[PDB]
Amino acid sequence: AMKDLKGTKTAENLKQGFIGESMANRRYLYFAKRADEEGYPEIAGLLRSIAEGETAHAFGHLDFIRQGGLTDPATDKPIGTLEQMIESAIAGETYEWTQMYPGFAKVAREEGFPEVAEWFETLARAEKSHAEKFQNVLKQLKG
Amino acid sequence: AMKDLKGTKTAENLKQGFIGESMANRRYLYFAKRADEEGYPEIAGLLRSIAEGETAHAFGHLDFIRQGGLTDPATDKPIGTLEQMIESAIAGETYEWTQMYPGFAKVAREEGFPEVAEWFETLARAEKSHAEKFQNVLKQLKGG
Ligand SMILES: [Cl-]
Ligand SMILES: [Cl-]
Ligand SMILES: [Fe+3]
Ligand SMILES: [Fe+3]
Ligand SMILES: [Fe+3]
Ligand SMILES: [Fe+3]
Ligand SMILES: [O-]
Ligand SMILES: [O-]
């Protein structure tokens, strides 16, 4: 591996860089769909290509995070081995279905946004399904 | 009014949901590559399929954000129209190349991590290129 990054500002900067690059890929693919609808195929293709750049950037941030002994930006769990990667996926999905999306749904209903609440409730059930499927993966890797 | 979400906690939750879903898709595609190398194609395929779920979630969050008159989670700029979307991309990439990545690179060098610094410098130049390409897009939308 590489030099230990724990405790540095660079460790936090890699995390923040990963967050921004992740958002950018999602944003640019969403924007490309609007270009698609409106008939701007060269713009849409450029947006998709820039999005591939942001993928490369996000993955490179993860490379340095993993090689520097740091944890997953999303879950604060190690992601050195495949088993650890799956354990990180389980931890994040579990946070999302047990805490995050149910709370978002409750708040949306309290604030008078039942349609948004229904979306958050759909997502809560979806993340529970994801968590169960990843748990099945881990069981198979450890057997 | 679901069409005016400004200032509500639900607005903040949509933003945070978008951030988490965006990271999840990137993480699961990265993890899939390790499964690929090691010969676990069913695990890799599951990671890729779940990642498509996280794409749908992120895009749905953006749908509610736009429909509610809220701004881009990354830039705090409106993203209703295509021109606005491109203007948001320009603002974010400009921040990344003029401030964010150069600052990250300086810190990495000062902390004794030259390989990470070089990566941040490569990314700074890349985001400058991205900003210029988005600027060209805006020129084309405006008539160029
Ligand atoms: Cl075009
Ligand atoms: Cl497999
Ligand atoms: Fe980037
Ligand atoms: Fe999830
Ligand atoms: Fe999700
Ligand atoms: Fe960028
Ligand atoms: O980026
Ligand atoms: O998720």
UniProtKB/TrEMBL annotation, chain A:
Pfam families: Rubrerythrin
Residues where Fe(3+) 3 binds: 54, 93, 127, 130
Entry's Gene Ontology molecular function annotations: metal ion binding; oxidoreductase activity
Residues reported to bind Fe(3+) 2: 54, 93, 96, 127
Binding positions (Fe(3+) 1): 21, 54, 57, 127
Residue numbers binding Mn(2+) 1: 21, 54, 57, 127
Binding positions (Mn(2+) 2): 54, 93, 127, 130
Keywords: Metal-binding, Zinc
InterPro entries: Ferritin-like, Ferritin-like_diiron, Ferritin-like_SF, Rbr2/Nigerythrin, Rr_diiron-bd_dom
Positions annotated to bind Zn(2+): 54, 93, 127, 130
Keyword Zinc among UniProt keywords: yes
Name of the molecule in the record: Sulerythrin
Organism, scientific name: Sulfurisphaera tokodaii (strain DSM 16993 / JCM 10545 / NBRC 100140 / 7)
